[PDB]
């Protein structure tokens, strides 16, 4: 049939920040995952519910690509379990995950000489997240026992906080761009699948 846009998901100039990860439904395609797996540009390419070399020959109901940017150190946090700050308060992967995770270092796009403070991640949430929960609202948080009516005094904090992202940062503190594909292996009529 016709190809589908992996180009505008991987050749993306602007990747959304992690607390507001960007989701995209791609369908009605002939998807060639050989391009991704044969590309050496990635650092982590980990498929969970399938085998990465057998992705050409299946057929999927709908495939969703999530996209964001995180610190290089904690790209481990992206797993079906694997609790942690982004893994719990920011991006929650369901345990029964059937998809793939791709992450590559992008220190030369996201980290500027003065330091990039436009990338924010959420901290101090009242509770964890549902799997695949997008939470763009950041009201004032309550930490101690005060009434947080727009105040920020010593016990009423703001949830968002910035990464450093300087070119001098260590190999683990550099930004990594993450795109995670989740497949709907349902037996509805197929819409997206390779040759």
């Amino acid at each position, epitope marked *: 049939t016709n190809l589908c846009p992996f180009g505008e998901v991987f050749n993306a*100039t602007r990747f959304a920040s992690v607390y507001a990860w960007n989701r995209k439904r791609i369908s009605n395609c002939v998807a060639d995952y050989s391009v991704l797996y044969n590309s050496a540009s990635f650092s982590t390419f980990k498929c969970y519910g399938v085998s990465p070399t057998k992705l050409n020959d299946l057929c999927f109901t709908n495939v969703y690509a999530d996209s964001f940017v995180i610190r290089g150190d904690e790209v481990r946090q992206i797993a079906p379990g694997q609790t942690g700050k982004i893994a719990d308060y920011n991006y929650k992967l369901p345990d029964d995950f059937t998809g793939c995770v791709i992450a590559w270092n992008s220190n*030369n*796009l996201d980290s500027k*000489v003065g330091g*990039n403070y*436009n*990338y*924010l991640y959420r901290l101090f949430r009242k509770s964890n997240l549902k799997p695949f929960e997008r939470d763009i609202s950041t009201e004032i948080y309550q930490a101690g026992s005060t009434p947080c009516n727009g105040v920020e005094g010593f016990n009423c904090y703001f949830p968002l906080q910035s990464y450093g992202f300087q070119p001098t940062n260590g190999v683990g503190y550099q930004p990594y761009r993450v795109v995670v594909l989740s497949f709907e292996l349902l037996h509805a009529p197929a819409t997206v699948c390779g040759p």
Partner: antibody
Amino acid sequence: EVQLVESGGGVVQPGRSLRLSCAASGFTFSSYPMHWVRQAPGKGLEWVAVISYDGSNKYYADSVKGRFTISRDNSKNTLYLQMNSLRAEDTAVYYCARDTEDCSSTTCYVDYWGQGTLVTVSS
Amino acid sequence: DIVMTQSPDSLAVSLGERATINCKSSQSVLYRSNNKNYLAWYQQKPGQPPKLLIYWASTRESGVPDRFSGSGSGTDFTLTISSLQAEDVAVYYCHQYYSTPFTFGGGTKVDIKR
């Protein structure tokens, strides 16, 4: 203040190859990307290329991709653009133009422009 | 890519009157991780390099009279000139800076109505 002066340019023949250079002063030339913007007489501005502050990533336009090559000599504080296989539609006024890194990623909008050259294509 | 359409072509207005130019992008140039709106508004006098007038589609560049104002969001934006003077006969350009390649608009030769 930043002073950008665009050298080179003038007269070319169809199929010739030319080389423009912007000499910039007033700021750290190695910590700001740079753009080229073409403007054919009386038509309107059009993007051409872009660089990154360490001279690694280079993105072009659609009607140029594979014809021009844009490099950047940090040591001499200069920006070079090599034009190859010029067609009759490439006569225009070329502006160098300095970025201002505020956008989330590297490439961002452009704020300070330089006086234009007069690349003219006809034999 | 993302293509900008800027309307109208000529916008003739007499002094003291208002004015409004509009621009529509093919896709939605609106970053969401911040609430910033990647788009900018330049102007050009005849025979000079352009200037910057609006960035983030609303803010103003230092050194610009209050008479200009950029409004809009998503994929619809407008530059509003409240009052007109002698030094506002110039062709105005829109310019996204979301996805490479960047793109400009066709212009708007804001003349003087007499």
